């Protein structure tokens, strides 16, 4: 059941912002590893004396990488006179975030009808303000509230081309990489306690529970906007298990709550994973270990309806996971952590079914793969 209870008009995921120590090196690694184009910049060359910000795009997916310059470059500025293109940026907050968490997502940004209204309604409904609404060049409004840990939910609204003060990247520097990724499907937080986290976020957004999960080491639940295109799962650890909770491992290495993974939808997950796997050892991203061939021997018994044995053969080569709802089927795979710490990682997914356009969350989030991978591992020892 979908009570359609959003307290303000939400459209789509807009962008994800990473706070880095060096935005250049992270952005170039991600660009090559994920096949994203360099599409906009705000930095010294555009007159920004405060922060360096580089935008990568693939389809509708927008990854922003930001790092501070020396505060000495902008010591004479005040907020009214700032050369920053993102007004919520703060040297001290950014350095504190990165020193505490390492490389990670600072902002999950959603496009709304009216960012000032969204901020006002959010705060009136319990949200903790982070950055008040600010109008950029009478064209875009941006506002931020706290989501979990040091991650903020960022509202962006446009009157009528990322942000004012960002310049389009010249095509000689913008190589048209594309491995098939097209949009952000969901963004998942890890927190120490799920109940209070859900009550807080659902409280100021009005997002409704879409799904929920629960020996796997976690409990989780998914918050969703009215049309269920903005999906915000949250995990908490389950203590006492023989194998230690990876949610707890995350919290320890991340120094508390934060964004656990970003799921990126591909229009052709086989092409995406072929392209990403070719680059894993030459600057790209590594993938989690493949499931045993038992898992794929069982796959015919569960999705032989949807995938040909040739297409299942291809899943086995690429190490792709498959799960199935009563409503749709999900193809998914997980990278190893994106940086030094065993914290944030990326999920590549593709959904089949729920045609009306495709409805959000078609096929779920892969809950069934906990059991079937444990079963497949038991069957391999044989």
Annotated binding site for Fe cation: 186, 261, 347
Residues 118 to 177 in contact with ligand N1K, rule: CB under 6 A: none
Hey, what are 229's tokens? 């295109």
Choose, by CB under 8 A, the member of 172, 240, 305, 356 that binds a copy of itself.
Answer: 172
**For ligand N1K, the closer CB: 235 or 350:** 235
Beta strand residue intervals within 256-302, DSSP E? 258-266
Site string for Co ion, 328-347 (x = CB under 5 A): -------------------x
**For a copy of itself, the closer CB: 13 or 97:** 97
Binding segment toward a copy of itself, per CB under 8 A, in 29-37, 121-129, 322-330, 356-364: 29-37
- Any contact of residue 263 with Co ion (CB under 5 A)? yes
- Any contact of residue 286 with a copy of itself (CB under 8 A)? yes
* Residue 28 site contact among a copy of itself, ligand N1K, Co ion, none (CB < 5 to 8 Å, cut-off depends on kind): a copy of itself
Beta bridge partners of 233: 222
Half-sphere exposure of 333 (CA within 13 A, CB side): 24
- Provide φ and ψ at 311, rounded to 5°: -70, -30
Residues 316 to 345 in contact with a copy of itself, rule: CB under 8 A: 338-342
Instruction: Write the DSSP string, 185-198.
Output: EEEEEE-S-HHHHH
Q: Distance between CA 382 and CA 378 in Å, rounded?
A: 7
Residue 229: CB atoms within 10 Å: 21
- Any contact of residue 323 with Co ion (CB under 5 A)? no
**For Co ion, the closer CB: 74 or 335:** 335
Residue tagged 């976690």 (tokens):
218
**For ligand N1K, the closer CB: 159 or 336:** 336
- Any contact of residue 245 with ligand N1K (CB under 6 A)? no
Report whether 269 contacts 18 (CB < 8 A).
Answer: no
Rounded least distance, CB 22 to a copy of itself, Å:
4
Report, in this order, helix, strand and coil percent for the chain, each rounded to 5. 30, 35, 35
Q: Distance between CA 146 and CA 151 in Å, rounded?
A: 6
Residues 77 to 136 in contact with a copy of itself, rule: CB under 8 A: 95, 98-100, 102-103
Residues 6+ apart with CB under 8 A from 226: 2, 4, 5, 6, 10
Q: Distance between CA 313 and CA 307 in Å, rounded?
A: 10
* Residue 166 site contact among a copy of itself, ligand N1K, Co ion, none (CB < 5 to 8 Å, cut-off depends on kind): none
- Provide φ and ψ at 76, rounded to 5°: -85, -10
Report whether 109 contacts 16 (CB < 8 A).
Answer: yes
Residues that bind a copy of itself (CB under 8 A): 20-26, 28-29, 31-33, 38, 43-44, 52, 67, 69-70, 72-73, 95, 98-100, 102-103, 172-175, 177, 252-253, 255, 281-284, 286, 338-342
Residues that bind Co ion (CB under 5 A): 263, 347, 365
Residues that bind ligand N1K (CB under 6 A): 186, 188, 213, 220, 222, 233, 235, 334, 347, 365-366, 369-370, 373
């Amino acid at each position: 059941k979908n009570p359609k209870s959003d307290k303000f008009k939400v459209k789509r995921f807009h962008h994800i912002e990473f706070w880095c120590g060096d935005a250049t090196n992270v952005a170039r690694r991600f660009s090559w590893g994920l096949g994203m184009r360099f599409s906009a910049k705000s930095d010294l060359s555009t007159g920004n004396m405060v922060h360096a910000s580089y935008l990568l795009t693939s389809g509708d997916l927008r990854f922003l990488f930001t790092a501070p310059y020396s505060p000495s470059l902008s010591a004479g500025e005040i907020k009214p006179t700032t050369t920053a293109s993102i007004p919520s940026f703060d040297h001290g907050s950014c350095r504190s975030f990165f020193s505490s968490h390492g490389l990670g997502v600072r902002a999950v940004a959603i496009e709304v009808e009216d960012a000032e209204s969204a901020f006002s309604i959010s705060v009136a409904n319990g949200a903790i303000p982070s950055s008040p609404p600010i109008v950029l060049n009478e064209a875009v409004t941006i506002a931020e509230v706290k989501l979990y840990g040091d991650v903020v939910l960022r509202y962006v609204s446009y009157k009528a081309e990322f942000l004012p003060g960002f310049e389009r990247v010249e095509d000689a520097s913008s190589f048209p990489l594309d491995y098939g990724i097209r949009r952000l499907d969901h963004a998942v937080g890890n927190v120490p306690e799920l109940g209070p986290a859900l009550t807080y976020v659902a409280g100021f957004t009005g997002f409704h529970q879409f799904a929920e999960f629960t020996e796997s080491g976690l409990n989780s639940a998914v918050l969703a906007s009215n049309d269920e295109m903005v999906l915000l799962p949250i995990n908490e650890p389950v203590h006492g298990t023989k194998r230690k909770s990876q949610i707890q491992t995350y919290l320890e290495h991340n120094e508390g709550a934060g964004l656990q993974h970003l799921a990126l939808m591909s229009e052709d997950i086989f092409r995406t994973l072929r392209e990403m796997r070719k680059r894993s050892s030459i600057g790209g991203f590594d993938f989690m270990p493949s499931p045993p061939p038992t898992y794929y021997q069982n796959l015919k018994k569960r999705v032989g309806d949807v995938l040909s044995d040739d297409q299942i053969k291809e899943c086995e080569e690429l190490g792709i996971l498959v799960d199935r709802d009563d409503q749709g089927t999900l193809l998914q795979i997980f990278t190893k952590p994106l940086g030094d710490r065993p914290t944030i990682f990326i999920e590549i997914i593709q959904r089949v079914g729920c045609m009306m356009y495709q409805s959000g969350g078609c096929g779920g989030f892969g809950k069934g793969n906990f059991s079937e991978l444990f079963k497949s591992i038991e069957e391999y020892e044989k």
